[PDB]
Design a protein around this ligand. Structure first.
Ligand SMILES: *[C@@H]1O[C@H](CO)[C@@H](O[C@@H]2O[C@H](CO)[C@@H](O)[C@H](O)[C@H]2NC(C)=O)[C@H](O)[C@H]1NC(C)=O
Ligand SMILES: *[C@@H]1O[C@H](CO)[C@@H](O)[C@H](O)[C@H]1NC(C)=O
Ligand SMILES: *[C@@H]1O[C@H](CO)[C@@H](O)[C@H](O)[C@H]1NC(C)=O
Ligand SMILES: *[C@@H]1O[C@H](CO)[C@@H](O)[C@H](O)[C@H]1NC(C)=O
Lengths: 97, 595
């Protein structure tokens, strides 16, 4: 609803051509030309080396699969530290006598 | 490294690259004249140029990729589509003169400009060429129009098209292709493939067998059709007289639905209606369209998207906002599909919504495949699936599922109107035309022998096979084979051979699964909840599998067969025998067309 307009929203950056797959809890920022062939093209787009970067075209009339989605991953860990990130919200009204 | 992995690697990028520009090509197919034109035509015309220009760079480097040494066709089918040689075999000088021929008939032939004395009846689409025949039967049109139409067409269209016929086929012989016709069947004929080395071997003998049993029944049918036509104009429509092709409701007379009006058997019989709601009920087509979807998904058809529902119309506003009556599949892709047709208040467009909006559901049925593979098994499969249920729209049995009228309404057995026969006129009337039109264009592109017999042999079998004798013999000044709407514009007519048969093969299978044999025309496709649990796998396979394997699930056959047509005419034939006993079967052979 708030991330689609005609012509396609190209601000988001994704790649689908990388030399190797990623690892769990790993972030990849560096990008290299996808030199699939053994013949080096010296980093110039053409044969045996394709552009790694790509962008989705987010026009509003796209289908649900093509509809952009915002996904949040909530990771939990216990490295044996006393830190705590929770807290109860239960408190009955007190009574006397 | 081997190019085998590199070739697939570019295919990942190529799929995304194709999808972006294809959206632009199909962006607007009606935004031409509805309002004023700030810029409408040049918007997508340039986009197609950009897509074609981007396609040429994509195709050109795709040739370096190893097309050979590919023993399996699972993914080579995507390689071959892009790596087709296409028009690139020709030189720049050869390509320049090709477009000269294409625009020759684009102006003189598209509109009919032939002078008439006092302009009693001009030979043009305006004003109301087709409709004027259903009310007026003027004698002058019946003879004068035959000479005048082709007088201004064949002068220049005969010699110019010779260059494409002969000179443009030099590369076909280089690639062993017989003609452009063999190029049209590139997808049908696959060689050098493991276990799928399938060709069109039946093309040697498909022509003869299918028309063996048609002729004896075809001769009987025309006797009954012509019987009701005696009282119209006995001076020219006589049992001895023959009707030329221009006298069958069109300038070419290929479709014979115009012949129904003059052949009404009973004018005094009271008539009921399929809807029967022409009152203050104010029936809305969108409501029934919603009511028709359940039958469409009764055979597991994927639901067509919300684009049609979000943007459509019921009553035309009568303003600049209008949609022209263009029937076209919206291959937009990207998950986007919108159906915007002439949703007026007409009974005719009601019946065809099965081919208008219900046929569209095949587009996203194989949407899992890329854009190149988002298609049916072949051209005939795509077209024939949309015609399975169209013929039962006017059935009162279809109305029973609707529930608008009385559900307990009596089903009459007075099915003796020529409306039943009218459905056969279009199907079987044009069958002999498609039968011998393609045969003429098969060897003629080869040019093995001179053109001294191209005209006279063109007029040999058509005078007795279809019973049409031309009042005026045509000459080199008349390019009758090139006078068609498709031969002159290089349209592949080879689809008609497969699209016609497969529709009844698809239709008979549904009636077979609906325990309804005999009356094929009365197929009770309503409440067909018993067919969706098996045919759902065929939609997904798409082009990923040969059509031979898919055909087993409906008929279990490997070729083209004519069995459903036989039982189609049997209920009609029983009532047809008794009314044809006075008139002899067939027509005079090689009679004088003048009289
Ligand atoms: C199609 O079959 C359905 C049941 O499978 C029947 O239609 C239902 O009939 C009952 C009465 O027996 C009604 O209460 C329902 O409202 C009907 N549902 C629908 C969707 O119509 C009937 O045999 C057939 N329906 C037709 C012909 O409309
Ligand atoms: C009339 O309005 C739009 C507005 O841009 C115009 O582009 C188009 O020609 C027309 N739209 C339709 C749906 O006919
Ligand atoms: C065989 O099928 C695979 C499946 O992905 C395809 O990638 C390959 O191009 C096909 N042809 C070969 C390996 O020659
Ligand atoms: C019409 O005749 C058939 C027999 O051909 C019969 O089965 C059917 O019930 C009849 N329909 C009527 C009388 O409404």
């Amino acid at each position: 609803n708030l991330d689609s307009k005609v012509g396609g929203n190209y601000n988001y950056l994704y790649r689908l051509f990388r030399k190797s797959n990623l690892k769990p809890f790993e972030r990849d920022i560096s990008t290299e030309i996808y030199q699939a062939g053994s013949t080096p093209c010296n980093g110039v787009e053409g044969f045996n080396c394709y552009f790694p970067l790509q962008s989705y075209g987010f026009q509003p009339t796209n289908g649900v699969g093509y509809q952009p989605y915002r996904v949040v991953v909530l990771s939990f860990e216990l490295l044996h530290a006393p830190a705590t990130v929770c807290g109860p919200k239960k408190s009955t009204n007190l009574v006397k006598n | 490294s081997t190019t085998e992995e590199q070739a697939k690697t570019f295919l990942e990028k190529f799929n995304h690259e194709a999808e972006d520009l294809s959206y632009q090509s199909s962006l607007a197919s009606w935004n031409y004249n509805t309002n004023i034109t700030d810029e409408n035509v040049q918007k997508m015309n340039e986009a197609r140029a950009k897509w074609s220009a981007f396609y040429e760079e994509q195709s050109r480097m795709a040739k370096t990729y190893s097309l050979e040494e590919i023993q399996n066709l699972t993914l080579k089918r995507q390689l071959k589509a892009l790596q087709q040689s296409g028009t690139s075999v020709l030189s720049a000088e050869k390509s320049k003169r090709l477009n000269t021929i294409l625009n020759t008939m684009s102006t003189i032939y598209s509109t009919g400009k032939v002078l008439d004395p006092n302009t009693q009846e001009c030979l043009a689409l305006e004003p109301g060429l087709d409709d004027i025949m259903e009310n007026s039967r003027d004698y002058n049109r019946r003879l004068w129009a035959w000479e005048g139409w082709r007088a201004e067409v064949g002068k220049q269209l005969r010699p110019l098209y010779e260059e494409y016929v002969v000179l443009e086929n030099e590369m076909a012989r280089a690639n062993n292709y017989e003609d452009y016709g063999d190029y049209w069947r590139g997808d049908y004929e696959v060689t050098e493939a493991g276990d799928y080395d399938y060709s069109r071997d039946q093309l040697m003998k498909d022509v003869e067998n299918t028309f063996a049993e048609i002729k004896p029944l075809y001769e009987q049918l025309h006797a009954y059709v012509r019987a009701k036509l005696m009282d119209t104009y006995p001076s020219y429509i006589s049992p001895t007289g023959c009707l030329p092709a221009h006298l069958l409701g069109d300038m070419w007379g290929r479709f014979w639905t115009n012949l129904y009006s003059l052949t009404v058997p009973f004018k005094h019989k009271p008539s009921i209606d399929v809807t029967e709601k022409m009152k203050n009920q104010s029936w809305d087509a969108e409501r029934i369209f919603k009511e028709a979807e359940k039958f469409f998904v009764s055979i597991s058809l994927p639901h067509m998207t919300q684009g049609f529902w979000d943007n459509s119309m019921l009553t035309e506003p009568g303003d600049g906002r209008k949609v022209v009556c263009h029937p076209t599949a919206w291959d937009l892709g990207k998950g986007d599909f919108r159906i915007k047709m002439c949703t007026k208040v007409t009974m005719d467009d009601f019946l065809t919504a099965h081919h208008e909006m219900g046929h569209i559901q095949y587009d996203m049925a194989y949407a899992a495949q890329p854009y190149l593979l988002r298609d049916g098994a072949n051209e005939g499969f795509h077209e024939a699936v949309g015609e399975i249920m169209s013929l039962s729209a006017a059935t009162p049995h279809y109305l029973k599922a609707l529930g608008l009228l009385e559900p307990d309404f009596y089903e009459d057995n007075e099915t003796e109107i020529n409306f039943l026969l009218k459905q056969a006129l279009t199907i079987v009337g044009t069958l002999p035309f498609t039968y011998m039109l393609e045969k003429w264009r098969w060897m003629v592109f080869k040019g093995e022998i001179p053109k001294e017999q191209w005209m006279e042999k063109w007029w040999e079998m058509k005078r007795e096979i279809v019973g049409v004798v031309e009042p005026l013999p045509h000459d080199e000044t008349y390019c009758d084979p090139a006078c068609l709407f498709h031969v002159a514009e290089d349209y592949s007519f080879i689809r008609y051979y497969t699209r016609t048969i497969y529709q009844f093969q698809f239709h008979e299978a549904l009636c077979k699964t609906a325990n309804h044999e005999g009356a094929l025309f009365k197929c009770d496709i309503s409440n067909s909840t018993e067919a969706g649990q098996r045919l759902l796998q065929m939609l997904s396979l798409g082009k990923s599998e040969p059509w031979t394997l898919a055909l087993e699930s409906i008929v279990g056959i490997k070729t083209m067969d004519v069995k459903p047509l036989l039982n189609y005419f049997e209920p009609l034939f029983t009532w047809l025998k008794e009314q044809n006993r006075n008139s002899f079967v067939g027509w005079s052979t090689e009679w004088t067309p003048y009289s």
